[PDB]
Design a protein around this ligand. Structure first.
Ligand SMILES: NC(=O)c1ccc[n+]([C@@H]2O[C@H](COP(=O)([O-])OP(=O)(O)OC[C@H]3O[C@@H](n4cnc5c(N)ncnc54)[C@H](O)[C@@H]3O)[C@@H](O)[C@H]2O)c1
Ligand SMILES: NC(=O)c1ccc[n+]([C@@H]2O[C@H](COP(=O)([O-])OP(=O)(O)OC[C@H]3O[C@@H](n4cnc5c(N)ncnc54)[C@H](O)[C@@H]3O)[C@@H](O)[C@H]2O)c1
Ligand SMILES: NC(=O)c1ccc[n+]([C@@H]2O[C@H](COP(=O)([O-])OP(=O)(O)OC[C@H]3O[C@@H](n4cnc5c(N)ncnc54)[C@H](O)[C@@H]3O)[C@@H](O)[C@H]2O)c1
Ligand SMILES: NC(=O)c1ccc[n+]([C@@H]2O[C@H](COP(=O)([O-])OP(=O)(O)OC[C@H]3O[C@@H](n4cnc5c(N)ncnc54)[C@H](O)[C@@H]3O)[C@@H](O)[C@H]2O)c1
Ligand SMILES: CC(C(=O)O)C(=O)O
Ligand SMILES: CC(C(=O)O)C(=O)O
Ligand SMILES: CC(C(=O)O)C(=O)O
Ligand SMILES: CC(C(=O)O)C(=O)O
Ligand SMILES: [Cl-]
Ligand SMILES: [Cl-]
Ligand SMILES: [Cl-]
Ligand SMILES: [Cl-]
Ligand code: NA
Ligand code: NA
Ligand code: NA
Ligand code: NA
Ligand code: NA
Ligand code: NA
Ligand code: NA
Ligand code: NA
Ligand code: NA
Ligand code: NA
Lengths: 260, 260, 260, 260
């Protein structure tokens, strides 16, 4: 249980981040959500976190590709919550192309969100955690923070960068009651992945589900998707006392991807 | 909760394994314990698992440096439990010396217990898990399955071997409902480590607790020990549904050791 | 021997890059050098590469923190050389501060040079190498592309990012006659490190050489610096036929840093 | 050049080890060879090392699955050579089967040769290298010392163990003029691999060369074999001055295997 804890989840209007916010709320944490989407859906998300799980929930819109907006977001989040115990740096994007064709603006956008926002969010959060002598920073990296695939230069670079940044954060705050770890998922069937399944299905002239199977077969030995719920469970474990001395490391939920 | 689950923990008469057995019993699992020690203490351990936590508990004595004894142990364990859902391959020993002075019999003993017993125990357990379509194999490796220190050739070799074996086990059983992962602790203050703290204290002419601090400072950035209870919590997480697609990987609870 | 080969070394007016350019020239390669410094020193460097080693050498000034300048540099380099066989992405900077004090502009500057320039330089070079069916891209990462230290968030993030980018580059160009690998040095006594030795010497109130010894003792088990000449040798090996099937990997010359 | 150096290569009657011995002899080293095979072929190998390359060469038969035989081999080798500068621990075997079907005797045989012989050979060599203040220990691990595949439990465990042992050796002898590193090949078309290509060809009902292509496609992005000659080149680089501060690490020549 995380009763009383104050959590922030970036990019929690969709996908993995939405499940993170849900699982933390179900554990008893008040939650700040963030991200893009339809305003009606976002407000329904916010209000149902409160009405289902009896916590406080706030939505703060911030484009975390902007450094100052990210730092201002963390301040506003901590003000809303009355503190900041758990930060989940989750927001991210993907774009696929070979390096020589990879758009410079897409490189910049992926580095800005998937890497730099993790730095800026961490930097803003840390003094709050340091003052109280407790904190969790949970970075959502990827299997692609540990290994590579073709046509994902920016994303692999960014995610490797997140794994490095995680280690530094941990070392700088070792023994302070603050841990920092990176959750490294394999394939999870969110909109980020559905776009790649569709692109495969076209390339190969197959139906969407045959394409999903081929995507899994190439990388993920279990031949099953990792679920957002599972990953929310992992974040809840990282937030627990059992994980007091788990810091600076990666937690891979990837169906065997990185074992081979 | 692991209500109804059937667990086996090797080397669970002391240290980390004793906490593993305790946490699994507290989660509702029936438990087979194993290891050396005073018979009066072992029977008190067994009986109090039952009387505290309302599960069944059995003690089976087996020297797991012997391959056939290890395989016979798993059979006897599964017969006692009426099945075998969770295997924790935990028993291990340590000996410190530079390579050219390292006793050949100690190399053999460390390889036999710390590596080969994990293979033989896994081999015996797997068909039971494969038939039922569910299982957890949880190998207790070390930070020394990922990095080295001086004067620990056999142990580092064995533990690296366990990390490799974990990956194979996972891959071979991917998608079958069976996962295999390695918990990689840093320093935990058990008798295995107390011997090294004492040897330091002599070498340096300091008291035992100053020696414990020096041991931590050299390797473990948090400057705190990992606890057996924490590691029992990690095993309980690995046994959970959230960890259905966590397989073939390492879970480091090491206070930052492997981050630097 | 690399007789006839056409090489480019970024940040080759100082330190490791200067030794890279020297060793490649000594092996018979024509060389484009790059970087900041005193014009008189740079021209002496250029002209003495030619007069000592009988190759052609060119200096192209480009601030590689600018993406378009980096891409324009590679074009100008290939035009000067009449081709482009070997690219050494070496230019880099360092800044030390804890995350919450780490200047946003320094984060941006380190990401731009130490990571993004590697992407932009690679992207520009690749089509030239792909057309000829041979190439070497040699990225100078660090031990800090594999592990972390305190107060080096941006640099560790960038260098981990370079290690990831290296892997992608390799995979995308597997079998094409092009390899991409990352050289990961430990401490090398260049101006980048002399600044840190000086900062230590002040912090600890010791002389510069006692500070150098303390810097080595903390991280580098050999207690010796890696030399620029050694690293130039490593680049010459990577450029050789023996390394035709060495791709996507790290070559650590670090006195044991990453072994522990 | 390694003129005057004294080298020992285990398992150098076939495959990678034969190329190791050849390249070291071509660099000017006297060489002790070792392994099984036809006596006429072995003597022709020995004598042609001498007649082609003008060095001394000796063949010492030792079954390195036996610890004392391994230690006695190193003594006899050093006596033949008049010293011992470079030790290449290369001899190894393979067997494929799922864990629950994996023969206990094959586990024991693979651990004994592929792991324990590396320990015993290292232990015997080290005092000779320590006394002279120079040495190279070059362990032939595998991609399977870093990652796993199915049906290779013993081999993956052993090779991970070699990677760990390499790190310890390096750390214990840091700064002494002795380095220890592990060469980690991908597929190399020796008899060890030809057996697996044949087993595939049967399983799939295809010709041998289509099977070789399928073997490469599954693991090795370059779609080319690594050659024994290349690996001999890598050993010659490790033996060079440029590699004085390369210690405790892995040198992967694997066509991209471990990048993904
Ligand atoms: N889906 C996978 O298979 C997978 C695997 C490994 C890691 N990841 C990582 O998981 C994280 C979540 O990804 P997902 O699959 O749930 O994707 P998703 O597209 O479902 O969700 C992305 C979330 O980030 C938000 N977002 C995007 N741009 C933003 C910006 N500039 N500022 C603030 N918010 C922004 C979106 O609105 C959304 O809430 C990402 O970091 C991704 O890299 C995903
Ligand atoms: N303590 C640490 O800091 C630490 C760190 C990393 C990993 N580990 C690993 O944790 C595991 C448990 O170690 P611990 O610190 O609790 O040590 P411990 O000495 O307290 O416990 C060892 C257990 O194994 C049993 N045992 C020993 N030899 C055996 C044999 N031949 N057959 C069956 N049982 C045997 C002992 O009786 C005891 O129950 C080991 O695998 C060890 O390598 C320990
Ligand atoms: N010295 C070490 O111990 C060490 C260890 C690991 C990795 N590295 C890496 O080695 C590489 C070289 O570092 P060094 O120690 O030789 O440092 P150095 O300061 O001696 O040399 C840096 C070189 O890069 C050039 N440079 C800097 N900013 C630039 C810009 N914007 N555009 C173009 N050129 C620029 C400099 O003019 C100089 O030629 C760097 O990538 C560094 O991260 C160094
Ligand atoms: N071929 C590959 O693709 C590949 C890939 C990675 C690593 N490796 C490793 O390379 C090394 C050499 O393998 P290879 O492919 O050249 O195989 P190989 O079968 O051609 O050669 C094996 C050598 O070891 C010798 N040998 C076997 N048993 C021995 C014993 N008990 N005592 C002494 N010598 C013994 C053999 O006689 C032979 O000289 C092995 O360690 C292997 O694990 C091979
Ligand atoms: C697996 C998935 C991710 O890493 O986000 C991908 O897009 O590669
Ligand atoms: C840390 C501890 C262990 O790995 O068991 C040790 O003995 O090194
Ligand atoms: C070792 C050195 C480097 O990585 O450049 C440092 O500044 O940490
Ligand atoms: C690649 C090869 C080896 O590792 O020896 C194999 O048998 O898997
Ligand atoms: Cl890929
Ligand atoms: Cl050490
Ligand atoms: Cl540090
Ligand atoms: Cl596999
Ligand atoms: Na709180
Ligand atoms: Na940003
Ligand atoms: Na059960
Ligand atoms: Na055994
Ligand atoms: Na390390
Ligand atoms: Na050329
Ligand atoms: Na740039
Ligand atoms: Na000699
Ligand atoms: Na042996
Ligand atoms: Na991999």
């Amino acid at each position: 249980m995380l009763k009383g804890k104050k959590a922030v989840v970036t990019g929690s209007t969709s996908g993995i981040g939405l499940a993170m916010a849900t699982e933390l709320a179900k554990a008893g944490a008040d939650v700040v959500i963030n991200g893009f989407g339809q305003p009606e859906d976002i407000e329904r998300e916010r209000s149902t976190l409160e009405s289902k799980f009896g916590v406080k929930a706030y939505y703060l819109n911030a484009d975390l590709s902007d450094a100052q907006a990210t730092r201002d977001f963390i301040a506003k989040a901590a003000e809303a919550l009355g503190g900041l115990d758990i930060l989940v740096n989750n927001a991210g994007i993907q774009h696929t192309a070979p390096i020589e064709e990879f758009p410079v603006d897409k490189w910049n956008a992926i580095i800005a969100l998937n890497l730099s926002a993790v730095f800026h969010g961490t930097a803003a959060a840390l003094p709050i955690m340091q003052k109280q002598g407790w904190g969790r920073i949970i970075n959502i990296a990827s299997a692609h923070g540990l290994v590579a695939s073709v046509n994902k230069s920016a994303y692999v670079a960014a995610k490797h960068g997140v794994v490095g940044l995680t280690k530094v954060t941990a070392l700088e705050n070792a023994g302070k009651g603050i841990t920092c770890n990176a959750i490294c998922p394999g394939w999870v069937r969110t909109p980020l992945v559905e776009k790649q399944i569709e692109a495969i299905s076209q390339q190969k002239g197959i139906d969407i589900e045959a394409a999903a199977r081929e995507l899994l077969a190439e990388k993920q030995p279990s031949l099953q998707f990792v679920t957002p719920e599972q990953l929310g469970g992992a974040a809840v474990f990282l937030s627990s006392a059992a994980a007091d001395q788990m810091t600076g490391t990666t937690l891979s939920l990837d169906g065997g991807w990185t074992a081979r």
